[PDB]
């Protein structure tokens, strides 16, 4: 593949020099999607192709020939997780219930299109972003089937942002957008050997996205490099009246995150290496040891630290997600006039189509969520507050303050596991604190264990994306650990 592992800036430079145009790049990815996603290894990372992709690419080329460039992403093809609204494609969250539901563009999609990006299509995801049943299988949806890990197709691509991570790793697009509530961006990113960035809740509008939790939800870029992730973040970040969370950002400005790509970004930094059982995961010691060494040689101070209240928010998070899921999903159904208007309708639909929807696992989360008393319930209010406090101020922040640290690092998760009828064989995580706190996290490829990707996670306090990008980029540039999957 002529564009394999080529950065956004490099592709833009090529198009700007007139050695490449958007239609050629776009058709190249589409041909690759046909050869690896639908056939061959059958990655099934792409759930629907944008019928107007070629039309869009052609328009971006005409604008370029007319001297009307939109910016760094002009003519760059990307993919969107299927819970993000994007006309004229359907937005199903992987469900058969919304197969013919085609709402208008989400705010971030409008920003990407205005930036000149070309939408290739939508990527598969764990159905309903994995908030449907117990013992679920990551990367599976009734409409998109089973997405597979490109490094070993018998293994899990993890998730919920399964297709986005796989598409990026397999070079099916330049970059992709995923969403995270608790691990959905960074876990599949690490599992598939790519970069995943989950920003602070409030940096990127959640408007036009099928939700789970307004307290923890956020869209984020997935790319093969930190530089590409930074270019995408620059395009999607911004205040939106439709999403109150975006009005809480302190001193928001037209910020160019690519300006933070500093090769000396680790000099003078202080990093805390989290002491979790993940450091002892089979084959992990050598990798994390080498990573710490690279960070130190780069000029950073690395000290072992433990996260206060690790996991103490578990119960509170469960409660807040169930309450917020019902409230948010029903608001979304009404706002975009979906064919379903209540969670009860969805539960009923799955039962009526049990053969196609409930053959692998059930819908117990939907059922429990539908029974919640609403957002005025004192129990929910207390849970929402406790979770945020335990993971942020008294969690990540307490750890950062204890040793005056700039960030915390740790292996993101373990390696991919074989896909089986049974639920996922979850190895563990170190990213939940950031997800529950609503703080930024970013994973960068750190190496492999027996051919399967492992990532290094960076977590920081609210609004520290600039600093995290600097550190992650500096680390990435002296390691360049990503290795494409072999087909």
């Amino acid at each position: 593949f002529p564009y394999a592992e080529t950065d956004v800036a490099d592709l833009q430079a090529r198009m700007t020099a007139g050695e490449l145009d958007s239609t050629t790049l776009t058709q190249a990815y589409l041909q690759r999607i046909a050869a690896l996603d639908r056939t061959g290894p059958r990655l099934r990372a792409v759930i629907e192709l944008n019928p107007d992709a070629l039309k869009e690419a052609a328009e971006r080329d005409r604008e370029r020939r007319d001297g009307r460039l939109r910016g760094p992403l002009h003519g760059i093809p990307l993919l969107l997780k299927d819970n993000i609204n994007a006309a004229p494609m359907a937005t199903s969250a992987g469900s058969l219930a919304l197969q013919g539901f085609r709402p208008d563009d989400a705010y971030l999609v409008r920003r990407l299109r205005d930036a000149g990006a070309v939408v290739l299509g939508k990527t598969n995801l764990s159905e309903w972003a994995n908030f449907r049943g117990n013992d679920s299988i990551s990367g599976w949806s009734a409409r998109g089937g089973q997405t597979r890990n490109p490094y070993r197709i018998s293994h899990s691509p993890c998730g919920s942002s399964s297709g986005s991570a796989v598409a990026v790793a397999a070079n099916l697009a330049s970059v992709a957008i995923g969403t995270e509530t608790d691990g959905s961006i960074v876990c599949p990113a690490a599992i598939n050997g790519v970069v995943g960035l989950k920003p602070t809740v409030g940096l990127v509008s959640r408007d036009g996205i099928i939700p789970i939790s307004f307290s923890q939800d956020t869209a984020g870029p997935m790319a093969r490099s930190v530089a590409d992730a930074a270019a995408v973040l620059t395009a999607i970040a911004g205040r939106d009246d439709a999403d109150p969370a975006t009005a809480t950002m302190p001193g928001r400005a037209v910020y160019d995150y690519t300006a933070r790509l500093d090769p000396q970004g680790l000099r003078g930094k202080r990093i805390g290496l989290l002491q979790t059982p993940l450091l002892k995961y089979r084959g992990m010691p050598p990798l994390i040891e080498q990573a710490a060494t690279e960070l130190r040689r780069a000029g950073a101070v690395v000290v072992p630290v433990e996260l206060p209240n690790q996991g103490a928010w578990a119960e509170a998070e469960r409660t807040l997600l169930l309450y917020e899921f019902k409230a948010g999903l029903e608001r979304y159904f009404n706002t975009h006039r979906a064919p379903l208007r209540s969670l009860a309708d969805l539960i009923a639909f799955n039962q009526a189509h049990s053969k196609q929807e409930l053959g692998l696992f059930g819908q117990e989360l939907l059922v429990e969520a539908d029974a919640t008393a609403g957002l005025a319930d004192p129990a929910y209010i207390r849970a929402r507050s406790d979770a945020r406090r335990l993971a942020g101020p008294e969690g990540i922040d307490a750890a950062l303050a204890a040793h005056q640290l700039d960030a915390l690092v740790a292996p993101t998760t373990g390696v991919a596991w074989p896909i089986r009828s049974e639920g996922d064989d979850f190895p563990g995580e170190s990213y939940s604190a950031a997800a529950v706190a609503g703080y930024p996290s970013l994973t960068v490829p750190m190496g492999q264990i027996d051919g399967l990707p492992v990532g290094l996670l960076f977590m920081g306090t609210a609004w520290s994306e600039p600093k995290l990008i600097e550190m992650a980029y500096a680390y990435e540039q002296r390691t360049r650990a990503r290795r494409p999957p072999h087909f």
């Binding site: 972003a129 994995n130 919920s160 691990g183 959905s184 789970i212 997600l321 979850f426």
Partner: peptide, 4 residues
């Protein structure tokens, strides 16, 4: 409560 994983991977939403």
């Amino acid at each position: 409560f994983x991977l939403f």
